[PDB]
Amino acid sequence: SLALHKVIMVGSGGVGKSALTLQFMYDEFVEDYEPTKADSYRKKVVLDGEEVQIDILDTAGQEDYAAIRDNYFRSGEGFLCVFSITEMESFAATADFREQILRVKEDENVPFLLVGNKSDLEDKRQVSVEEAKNRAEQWNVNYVETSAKTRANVDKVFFDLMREIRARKMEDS
Amino acid sequence: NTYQEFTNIDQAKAWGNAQYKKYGLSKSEKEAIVSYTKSASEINGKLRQNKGVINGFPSNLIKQVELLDKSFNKMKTPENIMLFRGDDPAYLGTEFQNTLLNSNGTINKTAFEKAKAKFLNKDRLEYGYISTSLMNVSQFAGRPIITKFKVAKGSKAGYIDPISAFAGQLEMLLPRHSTYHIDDMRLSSDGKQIIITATMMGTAINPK
Ligand SMILES: Nc1nc2c(ncn2[C@@H]2O[C@H](COP(=O)(O)OP(=O)(O)O)[C@@H](O)[C@H]2O)c(=O)[nH]1
Ligand SMILES: [Mg+2]
């Protein structure tokens, strides 16, 4: 009888979906983790005084066709739309994930977070804070820059996404 | 004169967006600012550390300070406004660090009186940039000291929320090396918070 917040990691390949999951889970910066490797994780964390359990699906994505993708998009409760601040292509792609996620869940207000990862690579930034923050405002969601390397804001994105999921569960029931 | 104090978050945001859109900040000034918001603590700390002298700053930081300073030539408040921010006991002095508070969490009567004796009715020079907000947000509330800054029309002040790492909300930035007069210092009904009302006088850094 414990709350379970199912989080799904989305974003182009090589943006840091795995590193972020692993940094949050085992507090380590795992580099170049198998690109095509997918895995779900489930740990217990205390969210604002209350103890809950979080489930994180670290998607590979290279071959998750319509039926596979639709199933977990539909099952997932919260989404972390991750991209790399040093790769403009991954940022542009975030609109595709958003779109597909809202199409299957037939909802324009699902728990969602725009995450610009690799904030430690400021010298290679290709996406401006202004641009990303603006998009987040358009989608009516928060934008957070993280660094799976320095661990900056990693806990924040996962706990903030939960808070959004936990609140959406209140509106319903 | 009259001072515009925001009470509706949407009105505040709309207003801020209205000014920001007019700044016409270069890419470098925006970047300089985003960088300030990512490490305000280090930058302002280093500015206090040297009482404001920057000729000892590495090229990267000294370059950023210059951009920061001059960006204010583009950011002025069109009217009288009230800016808010919170601080800890160290703000009043090292000798307040572990003295300001009582064990029950309220401001200590004697500590407060010494605070007034030390600051009330006196100008104060801040070596670092002053980050504030257009409204009394939650980013504070749980802080021992609250300051209401009265910024007059035409003063250097810029809404930088569109490019900050959500350091609270409704981020407002004031120039470094500014002086202000503390007109009032009182306690809240709570008794666990000092409310400081001040008049912003301006900065000594006016390049260009
Ligand atoms: N500098 C830096 N590199 C990162 C960061 N996060 C991931 N990386 C690197 O970016 C590459 C892709 O990361 P990965 O976690 O595999 O991304 P995924 O494809 O979204 O799962 C790997 O070489 C990582 O070591 C970060 O925060 N900073
Ligand atoms: Mg991966």
Q: How far apart are CA A103 and CA A108, in angstroms?
A: 9
| Resolution limit, Å | 2.7
Take residue A172 and report the two structure tokens written for it: 């319903």
DSSP string, A43-107: EEEEETTEEEEEEEEE---TT--HHHHHHHHHH-SEEEEEEETT-HHHHHHHHHHHHHHHHHTT-
Q: How far apart are CA B72 and CA B159, in angstroms?
A: 11
Q: How far apart are CA A67 and CA A70, in angstroms?
A: 5
Is B48 annotated as ligand-binding?
A: yes
Q: How far is B162 from chain A (nearest CA, A)?
A: 6
Q: How far apart are CA A16 and CA A82, in angstroms?
A: 7
Q: How far apart are CA A37 and CA A59, in angstroms?
A: 8
Q: How far apart are CA B42 and CA B33, in angstroms?
A: 14
Take residue B6 and report the two structure tokens written for it: 């925001």
Take residue B38 and report the two structure tokens written for it: 């990512």
Locus of tokens 């994930």? A97
- Amino acid type, A162: M
Q: List B180's β-bridge partners, or say none.
A: B124, B200
Are the C-beta atoms of B153 and B77 separated by less than 8 Å?
yes
Q: List B197's β-bridge partners, or say none.
A: B148, B184
CA nearest to A116, candidates A156, A78, A77, A75: A156
Domain segments of chain B as ranges: 1-208
What topology is assigned to B1-208 in CATH? Toxin ADP-ribosyltransferase; Chain A, domain 1 (3.90.176)
Backbone phi, then psi, for B93, in 5-degree steps? 140, 155
Q: With DSSP H G I counted as helix, E B as strand and the rest as coil, what are the percentages for chain B, rounded to 5?
A: 35, 25, 40
Q: How far is B16 from chain A (nearest CA, A)?
A: 14
Q: Which of B131, B133, B155, B164 is catalytic?
A: B131
Going along chain A from its start, the domains and CATH numbers come out as: 1-173 (3.40.50.300)
Take residue A73 and report the two structure tokens written for it: 């998009």
Of B27, B35, B162, the CB nearest to A133: B162
CA nearest to A129, candidates B30, B20, B75, B66: B30
Strand, coil or helix: what is B49?
Answer: helix
Are the C-beta atoms of B89 and B99 separated by less than 8 Å?
yes
Q: Does B131 participate in catalysis according to the annotation?
A: yes
- Maximum Cα interatomic distance, chain A, rounded to a whole number of Å: 47
Judge residue A30's burial from the number of C-beta atoms within 10 Å of its C-beta, 0-12 exposed, 13-18 middle, 19 or more buried.
middle
State the count of interchain CB pairs (< 8 A) between A and B: 21
DSSP string, B96-127: GTTTSB-TTSSBPHHHHHHHHHHHTT-EEEE-
